């Protein structure tokens, strides 16, 4: 539960760091954002579940 | 090895952060050094 | 303080506030890269 929580919360940070540097260069070079429109979509969708994970999971640790 | 190769905009943002770092070290030194008050 | 669990992020949260400033800054990294057009 706890480590399970620190995992979700900690991974959620690295995804953000990655997501943040990503989306930019994404819409940036139109070398796609069609193939990456797939990547970004998964990052975005993923992110939300994660927040919801840490959200609900918070009430069990603290 | 001359002629611009190291893109300028990078020489700057690098030499730039480099100054905020040293000048920032000074600001930290203000709450620890001898110039402290503690 | 930060709820017991998140404590591991204490340090992280210590720098978050300053980020906004960075953006005003970046806009300059950019223009420099794009040769002040």
């Amino acid at each position: 539960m706890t480590i399970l929580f620190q995992l979700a919360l900690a991974a959620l940070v690295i995804l953000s760091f990655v997501m943040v540097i990503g989306v930019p260069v994404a819409y940036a070079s139109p070398q796609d954002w069609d193939r990456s429109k797939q990547l970004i979509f998964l990052g975005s969708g993923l992110w939300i579940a994660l927040v919801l994970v840490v959200g609900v999971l918070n009430f069990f640790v603290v | 090895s001359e002629g611009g190769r190291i893109p300028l905009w990078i020489v700057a943002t690098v030499a730039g952060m480099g100054v905020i770092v040293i000048v920032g070290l000074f600001f930290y030194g203000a709450y620890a050094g001898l110039g402290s008050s503690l | 303080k930060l709820p017991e669990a998140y404590a591991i992020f204490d340090p992280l949260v210590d720098v978050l506030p300053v980020i906004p400033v960075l953006f005003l800054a970046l806009a300059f990294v950019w223009q420099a890269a794009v040769g002040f057009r």
Partner: peptide
């Protein structure tokens, strides 16, 4: 103790997201 580790990365991050663009040359 030394969360300067943090700053450092999120710091070279800003310039990175434009540099990679200088490489993939496009949209700056």
């Amino acid at each position: 103790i030394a969360q300067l580790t943090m700053i450092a990365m999120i710091g070279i991050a800003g310039p990175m997201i434009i540099f990679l663009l200088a490489v993939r040359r496009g949209n700056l």
